[PDB]
Each structure stands twice: as C-alpha cells, then as structure tokens.
C-alpha cells in the first residue's frame, strides 16, 4: 500500500535525571490505535506494569511513569514501532 510510516509524536526524554525523583516519560504515535514495544537497555520488557513503573494508553498517546528513578532505570529506552522508532538514552545519576 502507501509507504507512510507511523510517525512518533513524542521522542523519549533526552535529559539527564537523578535517582530518587519521579520521572514521567511520554512517547506516543501520530495515529491512534497503534501499539508499541518497549525496549529497555537491550532487554525486551514484558507486557505488564508494576508499582515501579507503569504505562497508560489513551488512543494514540502512551505515558510511562517511573515512581523513583533508580540505577535499574538508568538503562537506555527505545520505543519500537512498525513505522518509525524512537530511541533515546537516559542517564540516571546517583544521589
């Protein structure tokens, strides 16, 4: 069909954060109904949230909220879509 790639409206947070603070990450697609895969530090995450970090869906928008930035979370974050792919590297420095 038409070679129109699904655009990523929100890139992943490029700024450096510190351990202990609550960081909200926003990455959504330009078209609603589309789902994505979360890739963290080379590890493919499982399809489920927890009290450490959770993601919400709303049509097109997807929000990943981490309650406390930790060394665990200091890994790279990539959002895999069939169209485009948003890749960003987060650095969580210690306190």
């Amino acid at each position: 069909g038409s070679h129109m790639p699904v655009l990523i409206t929100r890139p992943l947070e490029d700024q450096l954060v510190m351990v202990g603070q609550r960081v909200e990450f926003e990455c959504e697609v330009s078209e609603e109904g589309a789902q994505v895969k979360w890739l963290k530090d080379g590890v493919e995450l499982t399809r489920e949230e927890t009290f450490k970090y959770w993601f919400k869906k709303d049509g097109q928008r997807h929000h990943l909220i981490i309650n406390e930035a930790m060394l665990e979370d200091a890994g790279h974050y990539a959002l895999c879509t069939s169209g485009g792919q948003a890749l960003a590297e987060l650095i969580v420095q210690e306190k």
Side-chain angles (χ1 to χ4, degrees):
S2 38
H3 50 266
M4 297 302 181
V6 183
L7 299 316
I8 309 300
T9 312
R10 304 285 195 98
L12 280 308
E13 285 62 27
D14 62 283
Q15 77 293 332
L16 186 157
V17 298
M18 58 186 180
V19 174
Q21 70 170 30
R22 189 180 304 128
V23 193
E24 303 168 89
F25 306 102
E26 299 196 287
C27 191
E28 64 180 272
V29 286
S30 188
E31 201 175 301
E32 53 184 75
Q35 292 299 90
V36 296
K37 175 183 292 184
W38 294 101
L39 181 66
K40 180 271 172 181
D41 198 13
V43 184
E44 183 178 272
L45 298 179
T46 179
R47 191 189 185 257
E48 62 199 88
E49 60 276 85
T50 179
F51 298 109
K52 175 182 174 61
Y53 69 106
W54 61 278
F55 56 95
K56 184 183 180 300
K57 176 192 177 184
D58 185 59
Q60 52 172 88
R61 67 202 76 257
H62 305 287
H63 315 265
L64 179 64
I65 295 77
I66 293 183
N67 294 270
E68 295 182 290
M70 186 57 60
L71 287 308
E72 311 171 287
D73 311 73
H76 297 174
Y77 286 97
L79 179 130
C80 302
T81 314
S82 311
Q85 180 174 269
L87 199 166
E89 44 183 68
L90 180 69
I91 303 177
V92 184
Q93 288 185 148
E94 300 171 68
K95 298 187 85 299

Coordinates of all heavy atoms in Angstrom, one line a residue:
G1 N 0.8 -1.2 0.0 CA 0.0 0.0 0.0 C 0.9 1.2 0.0 O 1.9 1.3 -0.6
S2 N 0.4 2.3 0.6 CA 1.1 3.5 0.7 C 2.2 3.4 1.7 O 2.0 2.8 2.8 CB 0.2 4.7 1.1 OG -0.8 4.3 2.0
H3 N 3.4 3.9 1.4 CA 4.6 3.8 2.3 C 4.6 4.9 3.3 O 5.6 5.7 3.3 CB 5.9 3.6 1.5 CG 6.1 4.6 0.4 ND1 5.7 4.4 -0.9 CD2 6.7 5.9 0.5 CE1 6.1 5.5 -1.6 NE2 6.6 6.3 -0.8
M4 N 3.6 5.1 4.0 CA 3.5 6.1 5.0 C 3.8 5.6 6.4 O 3.0 4.8 7.0 CB 2.1 6.8 5.1 CG 1.8 7.6 3.8 SD 3.0 8.8 3.3 CE 2.3 9.5 1.9
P5 N 5.0 5.8 6.9 CA 5.5 5.3 8.2 C 4.7 6.0 9.4 O 4.4 7.2 9.4 CB 7.0 5.7 8.3 CG 7.3 6.1 6.9 CD 6.1 6.7 6.3
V6 N 4.3 5.2 10.4 CA 3.7 5.7 11.6 C 4.6 6.6 12.3 O 5.7 6.2 12.8 CB 3.2 4.6 12.5 CG1 2.4 5.1 13.7 CG2 2.3 3.6 11.7
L7 N 4.3 7.9 12.4 CA 5.2 8.9 13.0 C 5.1 8.8 14.5 O 4.0 8.6 15.1 CB 4.8 10.3 12.5 CG 4.9 10.6 11.0 CD1 6.2 10.0 10.4 CD2 3.7 10.1 10.3
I8 N 6.2 9.0 15.2 CA 6.3 9.1 16.6 C 6.2 10.5 17.1 O 7.1 11.3 16.8 CB 7.6 8.5 17.1 CG1 7.8 7.1 16.6 CG2 7.6 8.4 18.7 CD1 6.7 6.1 16.9
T9 N 5.1 10.9 17.7 CA 4.8 12.3 18.1 C 5.8 12.7 19.2 O 6.3 13.8 19.2 CB 3.4 12.4 18.6 OG1 2.5 11.8 17.6 CG2 3.0 13.9 18.7
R10 N 6.0 11.8 20.1 CA 6.8 12.2 21.3 C 8.1 11.3 21.3 O 8.0 10.1 21.3 CB 6.1 11.9 22.6 CG 4.8 12.7 22.7 CD 5.0 14.2 23.0 NE 3.7 14.8 23.4 CZ 3.4 15.0 24.7 NH1 4.3 14.8 25.6 NH2 2.2 15.5 25.0
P11 N 9.3 11.9 21.3 CA 10.5 11.2 21.5 C 10.7 11.0 23.0 O 10.1 11.5 23.8 CB 11.6 12.2 21.0 CG 11.0 13.6 21.1 CD 9.5 13.4 21.0
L12 N 11.7 10.1 23.3 CA 11.9 9.8 24.7 C 12.8 10.8 25.3 O 13.6 11.5 24.6 CB 12.6 8.4 24.8 CG 11.7 7.2 24.8 CD1 10.5 7.3 25.7 CD2 11.2 6.9 23.3
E13 N 12.6 11.0 26.6 CA 13.3 12.1 27.4 C 14.8 12.0 27.2 O 15.4 10.9 27.5 CB 12.9 12.0 28.8 CG 11.5 12.5 29.2 CD 10.4 11.8 28.5 OE1 10.6 10.6 28.2 OE2 9.3 12.4 28.3
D14 N 15.4 13.0 26.7 CA 16.8 13.1 26.4 C 17.6 13.7 27.5 O 18.9 13.6 27.5 CB 17.0 14.0 25.1 CG 16.6 15.4 25.3 OD1 15.3 15.6 25.3 OD2 17.4 16.3 25.5
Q15 N 17.0 14.2 28.5 CA 17.6 15.0 29.6 C 18.0 14.0 30.7 O 17.4 13.0 30.9 CB 16.8 16.1 30.1 CG 15.7 15.7 31.0 CD 14.5 14.9 30.4 OE1 14.3 15.1 29.2 NE2 13.8 14.1 31.2
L16 N 19.1 14.4 31.4 CA 19.6 13.6 32.5 C 18.9 13.8 33.8 O 18.6 15.0 34.2 CB 21.1 13.9 32.6 CG 21.9 13.0 33.6 CD1 23.4 13.1 33.2 CD2 21.8 13.5 35.0
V17 N 18.6 12.8 34.5 CA 17.8 12.9 35.7 C 18.6 12.3 36.9 O 19.7 11.7 36.7 CB 16.5 12.1 35.6 CG1 15.6 12.8 34.6 CG2 16.7 10.7 35.3
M18 N 18.1 12.4 38.1 CA 18.7 11.9 39.3 C 17.9 10.9 40.0 O 16.7 10.8 39.9 CB 19.0 13.1 40.2 CG 17.8 13.9 40.7 SD 18.2 15.3 41.6 CE 16.5 16.0 41.9
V19 N 18.6 10.0 40.7 CA 18.0 8.9 41.5 C 17.1 9.5 42.6 O 17.4 10.5 43.2 CB 19.1 8.0 42.1 CG1 18.4 7.0 43.1 CG2 19.9 7.3 41.1
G20 N 15.9 8.9 42.8 CA 15.0 9.2 43.8 C 13.8 10.1 43.4 O 12.9 10.2 44.1
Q21 N 13.9 10.7 42.2 CA 12.8 11.6 41.8 C 11.9 10.8 40.9 O 12.3 9.8 40.3 CB 13.4 12.8 41.1 CG 14.0 12.5 39.7 CD 14.3 13.8 38.9 OE1 14.5 14.9 39.5 NE2 14.2 13.7 37.6
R22 N 10.6 11.3 40.8 CA 9.6 10.6 40.0 C 9.7 11.2 38.6 O 9.4 12.4 38.4 CB 8.2 10.9 40.6 CG 7.1 10.1 40.0 CD 5.8 10.3 40.6 NE 5.8 10.1 42.1 CZ 5.4 10.9 43.0 NH1 5.0 12.1 42.7 NH2 5.5 10.6 44.3
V23 N 10.0 10.4 37.6 CA 10.1 10.9 36.2 C 9.0 10.3 35.3 O 8.8 9.1 35.3 CB 11.5 10.5 35.7 CG1 11.8 11.2 34.4 CG2 12.6 10.7 36.7
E24 N 8.4 11.2 34.6 CA 7.3 10.8 33.7 C 7.8 10.9 32.3 O 8.3 11.9 31.8 CB 6.1 11.7 33.9 CG 5.6 11.7 35.3 CD 4.6 12.8 35.6 OE1 3.4 12.6 35.4 OE2 5.0 13.9 36.0
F25 N 7.7 9.8 31.6 CA 8.2 9.7 30.2 C 7.0 9.7 29.3 O 6.0 8.9 29.5 CB 9.0 8.5 30.0 CG 10.2 8.4 30.9 CD1 10.1 7.5 32.0 CD2 11.3 9.1 30.8 CE1 11.2 7.4 32.9 CE2 12.4 9.0 31.6 CZ 12.3 8.2 32.7
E26 N 7.0 10.4 28.2 CA 5.9 10.5 27.3 C 6.4 10.1 25.8 O 7.2 10.9 25.3 CB 5.2 11.8 27.3 CG 4.6 12.2 28.6 CD 3.7 13.4 28.5 OE1 4.1 14.5 28.3 OE2 2.4 13.1 28.6
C27 N 5.8 9.1 25.3 CA 6.1 8.7 23.9 C 4.9 8.1 23.3 O 4.4 7.1 23.7 CB 7.2 7.6 23.9 SG 7.9 7.3 22.2
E28 N 4.3 8.8 22.3 CA 3.1 8.4 21.6 C 3.3 8.5 20.1 O 4.2 9.1 19.6 CB 2.0 9.3 22.1 CG 2.1 10.8 21.7 CD 0.9 11.6 22.2 OE1 -0.1 11.7 21.4 OE2 1.0 12.2 23.3
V29 N 2.3 7.9 19.4 CA 2.3 7.8 18.0 C 1.4 8.9 17.4 O 0.5 9.3 18.1 CB 1.9 6.4 17.5 CG1 3.1 5.5 17.7 CG2 0.7 5.9 18.2
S30 N 1.6 9.2 16.2 CA 0.8 10.3 15.5 C -0.5 9.7 15.0 O -1.4 10.5 14.5 CB 1.6 10.9 14.3 OG 0.9 12.0 13.8
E31 N -0.8 8.4 15.2 CA -2.0 7.8 14.8 C -2.5 6.9 15.9 O -1.8 6.1 16.5 CB -1.7 7.0 13.5 CG -3.0 6.7 12.7 CD -2.7 6.0 11.4 OE1 -1.9 6.6 10.6 OE2 -3.2 4.9 11.2
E32 N -3.8 7.0 16.2 CA -4.4 6.3 17.3 C -4.7 4.9 17.0 O -4.9 4.5 15.8 CB -5.7 7.0 17.7 CG -6.7 7.3 16.6 CD -7.9 8.0 17.1 OE1 -7.8 9.3 17.3 OE2 -9.0 7.4 17.3
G33 N -4.7 4.0 18.0 CA -5.0 2.6 17.9 C -3.7 1.8 17.8 O -3.7 0.6 17.9
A34 N -2.6 2.5 17.5 CA -1.3 1.8 17.3 C -0.6 1.5 18.6 O -0.5 2.4 19.5 CB -0.4 2.6 16.4
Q35 N -0.2 0.3 18.7 CA 0.6 -0.1 19.9 C 2.1 -0.2 19.6 O 2.5 -0.2 18.5 CB 0.0 -1.5 20.4 CG -1.4 -1.4 21.0 CD -1.5 -0.4 22.2 OE1 -1.7 0.7 22.0 NE2 -1.3 -1.0 23.4
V36 N 2.9 -0.3 20.7 CA 4.3 -0.3 20.5 C 5.0 -1.3 21.4 O 4.3 -1.9 22.3 CB 4.9 1.1 20.9 CG1 4.4 2.2 19.9 CG2 4.5 1.5 22.3
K37 N 6.3 -1.5 21.3 CA 7.0 -2.3 22.2 C 8.1 -1.5 22.9 O 8.7 -0.6 22.3 CB 7.7 -3.5 21.4 CG 8.7 -4.3 22.2 CD 9.4 -5.4 21.4 CE 8.4 -6.4 20.9 NZ 9.2 -7.5 20.2
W38 N 8.3 -1.8 24.2 CA 9.2 -1.1 25.0 C 10.5 -1.9 25.1 O 10.5 -3.1 25.5 CB 8.7 -0.9 26.4 CG 7.5 0.1 26.4 CD1 6.2 -0.2 26.5 CD2 7.6 1.5 26.4 NE1 5.4 0.9 26.6 CE2 6.3 2.0 26.5 CE3 8.6 2.4 26.3 CZ2 6.0 3.4 26.4 CZ3 8.3 3.8 26.2 CH2 7.0 4.2 26.3
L39 N 11.6 -1.3 24.7 CA 12.9 -1.9 24.8 C 13.8 -1.1 25.8 O 14.0 0.1 25.6 CB 13.6 -1.9 23.4 CG 15.0 -2.5 23.3 CD1 14.9 -4.0 23.6 CD2 15.6 -2.3 22.0
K40 N 14.2 -1.8 26.8 CA 15.0 -1.1 27.9 C 16.3 -1.7 28.1 O 16.5 -2.9 28.4 CB 14.2 -1.2 29.2 CG 14.9 -0.5 30.4 CD 15.8 -1.5 31.1 CE 16.6 -0.7 32.2 NZ 17.5 -1.7 32.9
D41 N 17.4 -1.0 27.7 CA 18.8 -1.3 27.9 C 19.1 -2.7 27.3 O 19.8 -3.5 27.8 CB 19.0 -1.4 29.5 CG 20.5 -1.3 29.8 OD1 21.3 -1.0 28.9 OD2 20.8 -1.6 31.0
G42 N 18.5 -2.9 26.1 CA 18.8 -4.1 25.4 C 17.9 -5.3 25.8 O 17.9 -6.4 25.2
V43 N 17.1 -5.0 26.8 CA 16.1 -6.0 27.3 C 14.7 -5.8 26.9 O 14.2 -4.6 26.9 CB 16.2 -6.1 28.9 CG1 15.3 -7.2 29.4 CG2 17.6 -6.2 29.4
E44 N 14.1 -6.8 26.3 CA 12.7 -6.7 25.9 C 11.8 -6.8 27.1 O 11.7 -7.9 27.7 CB 12.4 -7.7 24.8 CG 11.0 -7.6 24.3 CD 10.7 -8.6 23.2 OE1 11.0 -8.3 22.0 OE2 10.2 -9.7 23.5
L45 N 11.1 -5.8 27.4 CA 10.2 -5.8 28.6 C 9.0 -6.6 28.4 O 8.6 -7.0 27.3 CB 9.7 -4.3 29.0 CG 10.9 -3.4 29.3 CD1 10.3 -2.0 29.6 CD2 11.7 -3.8 30.5
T46 N 8.4 -7.0 29.5 CA 7.2 -7.9 29.5 C 5.9 -7.0 29.4 O 5.9 -5.9 29.8 CB 7.1 -8.8 30.7 OG1 5.9 -9.6 30.7 CG2 7.2 -8.0 32.0
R47 N 4.9 -7.6 28.8 CA 3.6 -6.9 28.7 C 2.8 -6.8 30.0 O 1.9 -7.6 30.2 CB 2.7 -7.5 27.6 CG 1.6 -6.7 27.2 CD 0.6 -7.5 26.3 NE -0.5 -6.6 25.7 CZ -1.7 -6.7 26.2 NH1 -2.0 -7.5 27.2 NH2 -2.6 -5.9 25.6
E48 N 3.3 -5.9 30.9 CA 2.6 -5.7 32.2 C 3.3 -4.6 32.9 O 4.5 -4.4 32.8 CB 2.7 -7.0 33.0 CG 4.1 -7.5 33.4 CD 4.1 -9.0 33.7 OE1 4.2 -9.8 32.8 OE2 4.0 -9.3 35.0
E49 N 2.6 -3.8 33.7 CA 3.2 -2.8 34.5 C 3.2 -3.2 36.0 O 2.7 -4.3 36.4 CB 2.4 -1.5 34.4 CG 0.9 -1.6 34.8 CD 0.0 -2.1 33.7 OE1 -0.1 -3.4 33.6 OE2 -0.6 -1.3 33.0
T50 N 3.9 -2.4 36.8 CA 4.1 -2.7 38.2 C 4.2 -1.4 39.0 O 4.1 -0.3 38.4 CB 5.3 -3.6 38.4 OG1 5.5 -3.8 39.8 CG2 6.6 -2.9 37.9
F51 N 4.4 -1.5 40.3 CA 4.4 -0.3 41.1 C 5.7 0.4 41.0 O 5.9 1.5 41.6 CB 4.1 -0.6 42.6 CG 2.7 -1.2 42.8 CD1 2.6 -2.6 43.1 CD2 1.6 -0.5 42.7 CE1 1.4 -3.1 43.3 CE2 0.4 -1.0 42.9 CZ 0.2 -2.4 43.2
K52 N 6.7 -0.1 40.3 CA 7.9 0.5 40.0 C 7.7 1.5 38.8 O 8.1 2.7 38.9 CB 9.0 -0.5 39.6 CG 10.3 0.1 39.2 CD 11.3 -1.0 38.8 CE 12.6 -0.4 38.3 NZ 13.3 0.5 39.2
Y53 N 7.1 1.0 37.8 CA 6.9 1.8 36.6 C 5.6 1.3 35.9 O 5.4 0.1 35.8 CB 8.1 1.8 35.6 CG 8.3 0.4 35.0 CD1 8.0 0.2 33.6 CD2 8.8 -0.7 35.7 CE1 8.2 -1.0 33.0 CE2 9.0 -1.9 35.0 CZ 8.7 -2.0 33.7 OH 8.9 -3.3 33.1
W54 N 4.8 2.2 35.4 CA 3.6 1.9 34.7 C 3.4 2.7 33.5 O 3.8 3.9 33.4 CB 2.4 2.0 35.7 CG 2.2 3.4 36.2 CD1 2.9 4.0 37.2 CD2 1.3 4.3 35.7 NE1 2.4 5.2 37.4 CE2 1.4 5.5 36.5 CE3 0.3 4.3 34.7 CZ2 0.7 6.6 36.3 CZ3 -0.4 5.5 34.4 CH2 -0.3 6.6 35.2
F55 N 2.7 2.1 32.5 CA 2.4 2.9 31.3 C 0.9 2.9 31.0 O 0.2 1.9 31.2 CB 3.2 2.3 30.1 CG 2.9 0.8 29.8 CD1 2.0 0.4 28.9 CD2 3.7 -0.1 30.5 CE1 1.8 -0.9 28.7 CE2 3.5 -1.5 30.3 CZ 2.5 -1.9 29.3
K56 N 0.4 4.0 30.5 CA -1.0 4.1 30.3 C -1.3 4.4 28.8 O -0.5 5.1 28.1 CB -1.7 5.2 31.1 CG -3.2 5.3 30.9 CD -3.8 6.4 31.7 CE -5.3 6.5 31.4 NZ -5.7 6.7 30.0
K57 N -2.4 3.8 28.2 CA -2.8 4.0 26.9 C -4.0 4.9 26.8 O -4.8 4.9 27.7 CB -3.1 2.7 26.2 CG -3.6 2.8 24.8 CD -4.2 1.5 24.3 CE -4.8 1.6 22.9 NZ -5.4 0.3 22.5
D58 N -4.0 5.8 25.8 CA -5.2 6.6 25.6 C -5.3 6.9 24.1 O -4.8 7.9 23.6 CB -5.3 7.9 26.4 CG -6.5 8.6 26.2 OD1 -7.6 8.1 26.5 OD2 -6.5 9.8 25.8
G59 N -5.9 6.0 23.3 CA -6.0 6.2 21.9 C -4.6 6.1 21.2 O -4.2 5.1 20.7
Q60 N -4.0 7.3 21.1 CA -2.7 7.4 20.4 C -1.6 7.6 21.4 O -0.4 7.2 21.2 CB -2.7 8.5 19.4 CG -3.2 9.9 20.0 CD -3.0 11.0 19.1 OE1 -3.9 11.4 18.3 NE2 -1.9 11.7 19.2
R61 N -1.9 8.1 22.5 CA -0.9 8.6 23.5 C -0.5 7.5 24.5 O -1.4 6.7 24.9 CB -1.4 9.8 24.2 CG -2.6 9.6 25.2 CD -3.3 10.9 25.4 NE -4.1 11.3 24.3 CZ -3.8 12.3 23.5 NH1 -2.6 12.9 23.6 NH2 -4.6 12.6 22.5
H62 N 0.7 7.4 24.8 CA 1.2 6.4 25.7 C 2.2 7.1 26.7 O 3.1 7.8 26.3 CB 2.0 5.3 25.0 CG 1.2 4.6 23.9 ND1 0.2 3.7 24.2 CD2 1.3 4.7 22.6 CE1 -0.3 3.3 23.1 NE2 0.3 3.9 22.1
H63 N 1.9 6.9 28.0 CA 2.7 7.6 29.1 C 3.4 6.5 30.0 O 2.7 5.7 30.5 CB 1.8 8.5 29.9 CG 0.9 9.4 29.2 ND1 1.2 10.7 28.8 CD2 -0.3 9.1 28.7 CE1 0.2 11.2 28.1 NE2 -0.8 10.3 28.1
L64 N 4.7 6.6 30.1 CA 5.4 5.7 31.0 C 5.9 6.5 32.2 O 6.8 7.3 32.1 CB 6.6 5.1 30.3 CG 7.4 4.1 31.1 CD1 6.6 2.9 31.5 CD2 8.7 3.7 30.3
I65 N 5.3 6.2 33.4 CA 5.7 6.9 34.6 C 6.5 6.0 35.5 O 6.0 4.9 35.9 CB 4.4 7.4 35.4 CG1 3.7 8.5 34.5 CG2 4.8 8.0 36.7 CD1 2.8 7.9 33.4
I66 N 7.7 6.5 35.9 CA 8.5 5.8 36.8 C 8.5 6.5 38.2 O 8.8 7.7 38.2 CB 10.0 5.7 36.3 CG1 10.0 4.8 35.1 CG2 10.9 5.2 37.4 CD1 11.4 4.5 34.6
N67 N 8.1 5.8 39.2 CA 7.8 6.4 40.5 C 9.1 6.9 41.1 O 9.1 8.0 41.7 CB 7.2 5.4 41.4 CG 5.8 5.0 41.0 OD1 4.8 5.7 41.4 ND2 5.6 4.0 40.2
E68 N 10.2 6.2 41.0 CA 11.5 6.6 41.5 C 12.6 6.2 40.6 O 12.8 5.0 40.3 CB 11.8 6.0 42.9 CG 10.9 6.5 44.0 CD 11.2 5.9 45.3 OE1 11.0 4.7 45.5 OE2 11.7 6.7 46.2
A69 N 13.3 7.2 40.0 CA 14.4 6.9 39.1 C 15.5 6.2 39.9 O 16.0 6.7 40.9 CB 14.9 8.2 38.4
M70 N 15.9 5.0 39.4 CA 16.9 4.2 40.1 C 18.0 3.8 39.1 O 17.8 3.9 37.9 CB 16.3 3.1 40.8 CG 17.2 2.2 41.7 SD 18.0 3.2 43.0 CE 16.6 3.9 43.9
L71 N 19.1 3.2 39.6 CA 20.1 2.6 38.8 C 19.5 1.6 37.8 O 20.0 1.4 36.7 CB 21.2 2.0 39.6 CG 22.2 2.9 40.3 CD1 22.7 4.0 39.3 CD2 21.5 3.6 41.5
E72 N 18.5 0.9 38.2 CA 17.8 -0.1 37.4 C 17.2 0.6 36.2 O 17.2 0.0 35.1 CB 16.6 -0.7 38.2 CG 17.0 -1.2 39.6 CD 15.8 -1.6 40.4 OE1 15.1 -0.7 40.8 OE2 15.6 -2.8 40.6
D73 N 16.7 1.8 36.4 CA 16.0 2.5 35.3 C 17.0 3.3 34.4 O 16.6 3.8 33.4 CB 15.0 3.5 36.0 CG 14.2 2.8 37.1 OD1 14.7 2.5 38.2 OD2 13.0 2.6 36.8
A74 N 18.2 3.4 34.9 CA 19.3 4.2 34.2 C 19.6 3.5 32.8 O 20.6 4.0 32.2 CB 20.5 4.3 35.0
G75 N 18.9 2.5 32.4 CA 19.2 1.9 31.1 C 18.6 2.7 29.9 O 17.8 3.6 30.1
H76 N 19.0 2.4 28.7 CA 18.5 3.1 27.5 C 17.1 2.7 27.2 O 16.7 1.6 27.6 CB 19.4 2.8 26.3 CG 20.9 3.2 26.4 ND1 21.8 2.9 25.5 CD2 21.5 4.0 27.4 CE1 23.0 3.4 25.9 NE2 22.8 4.1 27.0
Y77 N 16.4 3.6 26.6 CA 14.9 3.4 26.3 C 14.7 3.5 24.8 O 14.9 4.6 24.2 CB 14.0 4.3 27.1 CG 13.9 3.9 28.6 CD1 14.7 4.5 29.6 CD2 13.1 2.9 29.0 CE1 14.6 4.1 30.9 CE2 13.0 2.5 30.3 CZ 13.7 3.1 31.3 OH 13.7 2.7 32.6
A78 N 14.1 2.5 24.2 CA 13.7 2.5 22.8 C 12.3 2.1 22.6 O 11.9 1.1 23.2 CB 14.7 1.7 22.0
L79 N 11.5 2.8 21.8 CA 10.2 2.5 21.6 C 10.0 2.0 20.1 O 10.1 2.7 19.2 CB 9.3 3.8 21.8 CG 7.8 3.6 21.5 CD1 7.0 4.1 22.6 CD2 7.4 4.3 20.2
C80 N 9.8 0.7 20.0 CA 9.7 0.0 18.7 C 8.3 0.1 18.1 O 7.4 -0.5 18.6 CB 10.2 -1.4 18.9 SG 11.9 -1.6 19.5
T81 N 8.2 0.8 17.0 CA 7.0 0.8 16.2 C 7.3 0.3 14.8 O 8.4 0.2 14.4 CB 6.4 2.2 16.1 OG1 6.5 2.8 17.4 CG2 5.0 2.2 15.6
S82 N 6.2 -0.2 14.1 CA 6.4 -0.7 12.8 C 6.7 0.4 11.8 O 7.3 0.1 10.7 CB 5.1 -1.4 12.4 OG 4.6 -2.3 13.4
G83 N 6.3 1.6 12.1 CA 6.7 2.7 11.2 C 8.0 3.3 11.6 O 9.0 2.9 11.1
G84 N 8.0 4.3 12.5 CA 9.2 4.9 13.0 C 9.6 4.2 14.3 O 8.9 3.4 14.8
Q85 N 10.8 4.6 14.8 CA 11.2 4.1 16.1 C 11.9 5.2 16.9 O 12.8 5.9 16.3 CB 12.2 2.9 15.9 CG 12.7 2.3 17.3 CD 13.5 1.1 17.1 OE1 13.0 0.0 17.1 NE2 14.8 1.2 16.9
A86 N 11.5 5.5 18.1 CA 12.1 6.5 18.9 C 13.1 5.9 19.9 O 12.8 5.0 20.7 CB 11.0 7.2 19.7
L87 N 14.4 6.3 19.7 CA 15.4 5.8 20.5 C 16.1 6.9 21.3 O 16.5 8.0 20.7 CB 16.5 5.1 19.6 CG 17.4 4.1 20.3 CD1 18.1 3.2 19.3 CD2 18.4 4.8 21.2
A88 N 16.2 6.8 22.6 CA 16.9 7.8 23.4 C 17.5 7.1 24.6 O 17.2 6.0 25.0 CB 15.8 8.8 23.9
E89 N 18.6 7.8 25.1 CA 19.3 7.2 26.2 C 19.2 8.1 27.4 O 19.7 9.2 27.4 CB 20.8 6.9 25.8 CG 21.4 8.1 25.0 CD 22.8 7.7 24.6 OE1 23.0 6.8 23.7 OE2 23.8 8.3 25.1
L90 N 18.7 7.5 28.5 CA 18.5 8.2 29.7 C 19.7 7.9 30.7 O 20.1 6.7 30.8 CB 17.2 7.8 30.4 CG 16.9 8.4 31.7 CD1 16.6 9.9 31.5 CD2 15.7 7.7 32.4
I91 N 20.2 8.9 31.4 CA 21.2 8.7 32.4 C 20.7 9.1 33.7 O 20.4 10.3 34.0 CB 22.5 9.5 32.0 CG1 23.0 9.2 30.6 CG2 23.5 9.3 33.1 CD1 24.2 10.0 30.2
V92 N 20.5 8.2 34.6 CA 20.1 8.4 36.0 C 21.3 8.5 36.9 O 21.8 7.4 37.2 CB 19.1 7.4 36.4 CG1 18.5 7.7 37.8 CG2 17.9 7.3 35.4
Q93 N 21.7 9.6 37.4 CA 22.8 9.8 38.2 C 22.5 9.6 39.7 O 21.3 10.0 40.1 CB 23.6 11.1 37.9 CG 24.3 11.1 36.6 CD 25.1 12.3 36.4 OE1 26.2 12.3 35.8 NE2 24.7 13.5 36.9
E94 N 23.4 9.2 40.5 CA 23.1 8.8 41.9 C 23.0 10.0 42.8 O 23.5 11.1 42.4 CB 24.3 7.9 42.3 CG 24.4 6.6 41.5 CD 25.7 5.8 41.9 OE1 25.7 5.3 43.1 OE2 26.6 5.8 41.1
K95 N 22.5 9.7 43.9 CA 22.4 10.7 45.0 C 22.7 10.1 46.3 O 22.0 9.1 46.7 CB 21.0 11.4 45.1 CG 20.6 12.1 43.8 CD 19.3 12.9 44.0 CE 19.5 14.2 44.6 NZ 20.1 14.2 46.0

